[PDB]
Amino acid sequence: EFQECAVCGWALPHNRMQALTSCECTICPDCFRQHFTIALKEKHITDMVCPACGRPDLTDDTQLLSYFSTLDIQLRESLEPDAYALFHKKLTE
């Protein structure tokens, strides 16, 4: 049944929500999209951590490639295409 978005406070079935590996905060698809679209367009990739808790610790290179490889599948489903391709562009740079 119903689980509350960690940022905006709106309840959706957990099947519909979006979790982030390396963290335990549930985010509604809206806040997930807006936060990562805004980080990708007006901030840098290291700012692309969880909007709810601030994790994983970036700036530590062992976790960077592995974080973005996991997060990629839900970015692919979640983001509009221009922001998904920009995320890949901002990653090989």
Binding site: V7, C8, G9, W10, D30, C31, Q34, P51, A52, C53, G54, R55, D57, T59
Partner: protein, 235 residues
């Protein structure tokens, strides 16, 4: 109750083509006729709302185009207003427990009523907060422009303030289980931070913490028998 059905019919007649005032009218009508507890006007592109059914305890109006709200009925306990264009809020009803206004344009909040437990106002333009009321359990104000934050009531469990400009942090109550402080202007932490529970979590990454502060923290958090919270602070 004779007013409502016709203030709604004139309201329905005085909008723009994008607004789904007809679907709104029907929902308002069914809610009143059945004296329902919840009104859901979400995702109808509405630019204003008329006078609301007076008996509702939950108002869910996220993802519209509202810049203001009409007076709030005096029994509401829960309001979902995320993703609008609100520039302000009306007087909050004394019954109010949860205020969710994330993703709006609010510059200042009204008085916070005494029963409020959940205040979610991320992505607004707040520069200051009212005094935080004593029953508050959850405060989300990340992504505003806050220069300071008021003293915290002693049941507050979750605190999120990422991306503000806060320069000093008031002492933390023992109720606190989760505190997101990244990307502020903190240079020190209150010693209360070390007295929180072992399961508690504190994130201060992206703050200009002084050298003496960082040395103190690495000294303690790596100490043998450290039983304080997990504190994330980058260097």
């Amino acid at each position: 109750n004779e007013f409502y059905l016709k203030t709604w019919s004139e309201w329905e007649k005085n909008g723009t083509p994008g607004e789904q005032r007809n679907i709104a009218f029907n929902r308002l009508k069914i809610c009143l006729q059945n004296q329902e507890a919840e009104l859901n006007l979400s995702e109808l592109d509405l630019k204003t709302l008329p006078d609301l059914p007076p008996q509702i305890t939950t108002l869910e109006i996220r993802k519209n185009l509202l810049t203001h709200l009409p007076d709030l009925p005096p029994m509401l306990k829960v309001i979902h207003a995320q993703f609008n264009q609100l520039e302000s809020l009306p007087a909050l009803p004394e019954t109010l427990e949860e205020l969710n206004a994330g993703d709006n344009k609010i510059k200042e909040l009204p008085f916070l009523p005494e029963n409020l437990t959940h205040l979610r106002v991320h992505n607004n333009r707040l520069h200051i907060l009212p005094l935080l009321p004593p029953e508050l359990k959850l405060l989300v104000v990340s992504g505003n422009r806050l220069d300071s934050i008021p003293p915290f009531p002693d049941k507050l469990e979750g605190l999120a303030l990422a991306n503000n400009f806060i320069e000093q942090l008031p002492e933390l109550p023992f109720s606190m289980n989760r505190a997101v402080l990244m990307n502020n202007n903190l240079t020190t932490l209150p010693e209360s931070v070390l007295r929180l529970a072992q399961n508690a979590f504190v994130n201060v990454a992206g703050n200009p913490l002084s050298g003496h502060t960082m040395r103190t923290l690495q000294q303690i958090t790596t100490g043998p028998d450290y039983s304080g919270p997990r504190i994330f602070f980058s260097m």
